[PDB]
């Protein structure tokens, strides 16, 4: 099986400067071209950089919107790519994917994505806050039951629950932006309401760029 | 650079029906049109290579069409699985170029929501800021409306709601609403009640707390 997993996107000062990476699994690495292609709500997918093989000079080609501030490299015994970007704009800000490029073709793995916000604002980690079962949360045999994460910068959150091992009937709310700046959302689950008191339900919320790792039990009330 | 435009943007269609994406290239591409299927926080993943082989797992419903300029996905047999954001790619000349994607909607009988109201927490009250949140789960369609009254007085400027992608396994949407008063405001007050309509729905469902019970 093909991996591709990204890591080091976060939060940057306008004309900062942050190092990504990807580390590559399941195919002869050395061979092949490796890319970063980013998505943004305003642009779409946009194609950044790629870096060709060893064989070929390890040639690098960028999108005229990055090239002179960002630099691709690999580590062929790491089976890693890098992009080192620099001179940082608002702009820049969005999703940034590893992917392979089959020798001028499709596009044909991706990785998860890692996210850069470019903003001169400060990271800032969550409060989690239960969502606590009552009878005014249960719609007959269903309870609901959730984590509110909030006061939150930058994006993102990941929520799961119970270690993953929960996930039929989870909402996970798009972020919204309040007034002040800060991000807030809410995790919910619907349950069978004679689970309640009886199985546990924990949200296990993550937000890197605070290092916030934060477990809450979820219980009813009283 | 050659543009790639898919319009619509936005297609929405009954299941079991057939549905068809256009990308249309700017200038000549041969056959060298790719299509990508995004679900909701997913990553991009390859269905069609060279506007009309799919690749290996892909669903047989999925086809491609189309050269020169003028190129075609279709989906047979739609199912919920589908709801996703559709994106063509050319790699006919450099720099490889996408589209702007297209969204499929999946259609389906109307489902009023289950709605739910959790009070603050303890926690967040010690903190002086209260959060009221009310949830509408599983609903179709997306267009609802929610109020919120404390002792009946209807609330404006001090809630804000955020609502799901449709749901690729059942076809529906969820919607939170959070209120969020400072704790002085929130204990000067007693009924909190959520107050919801939907097309779903035969008259408009309230939930509601007495703060403090
Ligand atoms: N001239 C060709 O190699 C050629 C020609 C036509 C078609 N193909 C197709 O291309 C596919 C893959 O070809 P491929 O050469 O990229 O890999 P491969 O899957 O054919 O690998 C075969 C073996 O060659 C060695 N190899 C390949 N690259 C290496 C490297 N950098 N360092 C050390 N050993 C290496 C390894 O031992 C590997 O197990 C195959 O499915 C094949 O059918 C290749």
């Known amino acids: 099986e093909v991996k591709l997993e990204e890591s080091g996107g976060g939060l940057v000062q306008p004309g900062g400067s942050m190092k990504l990476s990807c580390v590559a699994s399941?195919?002869?690495?050395?061979?092949?071209?490796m890319n970063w292609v980013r998505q943004s709500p305003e642009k779409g997918l946009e194609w950044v950089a790629e870096?060709?093989?060893?064989?070929?000079?390890?040639?690098?080609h960028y999108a005229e919107s990055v090239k002179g501030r960002f630099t691709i490299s690999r580590d062929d015994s790491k089976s890693a790519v890098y992009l080192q970007m620099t001179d940082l704009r608002t702009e820049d800000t969005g999703v940034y994917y590893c992917?392979?490029?089959?020798?001028?073709?499709?596009?044909?793995?991706w990785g998860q994505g890692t996210t850069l916000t470019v903003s001169s604002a400060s990271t800032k980690g969550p409060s989690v806050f239960p969502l606590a079962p009552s009878s005014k949360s249960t719609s007959g045999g269903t309870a609901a039951l959730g984590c509110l994460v909030k006061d939150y910068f930058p994006e993102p959150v990941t929520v799961s629950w119970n270690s993953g091992a929960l996930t039929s009937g989870v909402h996970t709310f798009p972020a919204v932006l309040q007034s002040s700046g800060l991000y807030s959302l809410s995790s919910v689950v619907t349950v069978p309401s004679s689970s309640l008191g009886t199985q546990t339900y924990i949200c296990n919320v993550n937000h890197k760029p605070s290092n916030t790792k934060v477990d809450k039990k979820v219980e009813p009330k009283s | 650079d050659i543009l790639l435009t898919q319009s619509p943007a936005i297609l929405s269609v009954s299941p079991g029906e057939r549905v068809s994406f256009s990308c249309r290239a700017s200038?000549?591409?041969?056959?060298?049109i790719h299509w990508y299927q995004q679900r909701t926080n997913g990553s991009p993943r390859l269905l069609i290579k060279?506007?009309?082989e799919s690749m290996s797992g892909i669903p047989s419903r999925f086809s491609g069409s189309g050269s020169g300029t003028d190129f075609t996905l279709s989906i047979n047999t739609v199912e919920s699985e589908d709801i996703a954001d559709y994106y063509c790619?050319?790699?006919?000349?450099?720099?490889?170029?996408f589209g702007s994607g297209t969204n499929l909607e999946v259609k389906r009988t109307v489902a009023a929501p289950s709605v739910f109201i959790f009070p603050p927490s303890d926690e967040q009250l010690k903190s002086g800021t209260a959060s009221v949140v009310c949830l509408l789960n599983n609903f179709y369609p997306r267009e609802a409306k929610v109020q919120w009254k404390v002792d009946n007085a209807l609330q404006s400027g001090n809630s804000q709601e955020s609502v799901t992608e449709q749901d690729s396994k059942d076809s529906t949407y969820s919607l939170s609403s959070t209120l969020t008063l400072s704790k002085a405001d929130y204990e000067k007050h007693k009924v909190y009640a959520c107050e919801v309509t939907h097309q779903g729905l035969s008259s408009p469902v309230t939930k509601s707390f007495n703060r403090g019970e």
């Open positions: 992917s392979r490029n089959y020798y001028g073709s499709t596009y044909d793995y």
């Open positions: 399941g195919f002869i690495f050395s061979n092949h071209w």
């Open positions: 870096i060709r093989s060893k064989s070929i000079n390890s040639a690098t």
């Open positions: 200038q000549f591409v041969g056959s060298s």
């Open positions: 060279y506007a009309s």
């Open positions: 790619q050319q790699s006919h000349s450099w720099p490889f170029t």
